[PDB]
């Protein structure tokens, strides 16, 4: 009966979850963690990553 309102809630949390999930994406880089990139590379290539 109350599917519409719950759907709005369902979309909003899912959108935040997707955005949160996007932090675990390498995006073509060596790692998804910025601290690892800083701890592992010199600034000329760390800047690229």
């Amino acid at each position: 009966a109350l599917g519409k309102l719950q759907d709005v809630v369902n979309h909003n949390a899912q959108a935040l979850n997707t955005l949160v999930k996007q932090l675990s994406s390498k995006f073509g880089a060596i790692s998804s963690v910025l601290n690892d990139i800083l701890s592992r590379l010199d600034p000329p290539e760390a800047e690229v990553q």
């Binding site: 701890s39 592992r40 590379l41 010199d42």
Partner: protein, 50 residues
């Protein structure tokens, strides 16, 4: 080169500064890690292929 020697390095603390101090190494090229950051990191699966 066809029978290259592989040595496993594990359960040791490595001082890479001496590698820099004495070095006739004309080529010293690193791909996935900075040369100067090796003293600040911990590693496993270390292999030397000669």
């Amino acid at each position: 080169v066809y029978a290259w020697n592989r040595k496993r390095i594990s359960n040791c603390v490595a001082d890479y500064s001496v590698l820099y101090n004495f070095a006739p190494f004309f080529a010293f090229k690193c791909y996935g890690v900075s040369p100067t950051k090796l003293n600040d990191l911990c590693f496993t699966n270390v292999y030397a292929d000669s």
